[PDB]
């Protein structure tokens, strides 16, 4: 689909406009600049990565693909929730971004719906955080966007095949 693939890629891009506005105020207002820094504690702290491993250029896999879509976009809406706003001047600037990330998960099921294809739970990726301080919370937020950028550069590659 065309259309869906404009709507698509106009959603995708409007989250990543948001992730980065959120790491720029975040960086602004916590001097957390630097995401890289941050990637050996989270690990420390057991945040789940979403997989988009039956996504890949050649050997696309179209079913499991949209299922990994699915459960991760998913993950990313609970990692952001398990942030709690960060804080009151973060605040709206999260919300945007969850509500960016629901609006392209909606267009992603309808499209699944379409192809009748039901989404498959993915591997355990164990517990969510609970991102228990300040601290924790604006290093989550840096650490979450800078991730959710990179799976939404992998997720263009489906999109031209949904018809």
């Known amino acids: ?3 869906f693939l404009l709507k698509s890629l106009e959603q995708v891009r409007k989250i990543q406009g948001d992730g980065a506005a959120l790491q ?4 602004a207002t916590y001097k957390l600049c630097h995401p890289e820094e941050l990637v050996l504690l989270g690990h420390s702290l057991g945040i ?3 997989p988009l491993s039956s996504c890949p250029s050649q050997a696309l896999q179209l079913a499991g693909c949209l299922s990994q879509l699915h459960s ?3 993950l990313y809406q609970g990692l952001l929730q398990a942030l709690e ?3 009151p001047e973060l605040g709206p600037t999260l919300d945007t ?3 960016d990330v629901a609006d392209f998960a909606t267009t992603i099921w309808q499209q699944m719906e379409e192809l009748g294809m039901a989404p498959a739970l993915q591997p355990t990726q164990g517990a969510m955080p609970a991102f228990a301080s300040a601290f924790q919370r604006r290093a989550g937020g840096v650490l979450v966007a800078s991730h959710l950028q990179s799976f939404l550069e992998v997720s263009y590659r489906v999109l031209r095949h949904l018809g």
Request: with cysteine.
């Open 24 to 27: 720029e105020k975040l960086c």
């Open 97 to 99: 971004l969850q509500l």
């Open 85 to 87: 706003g960060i804080s």
């Open 48 to 50: 789940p990565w979403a």
């Open 1 to 3: 689909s065309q259309s």
């Open 72 to 74: 991760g976009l998913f």
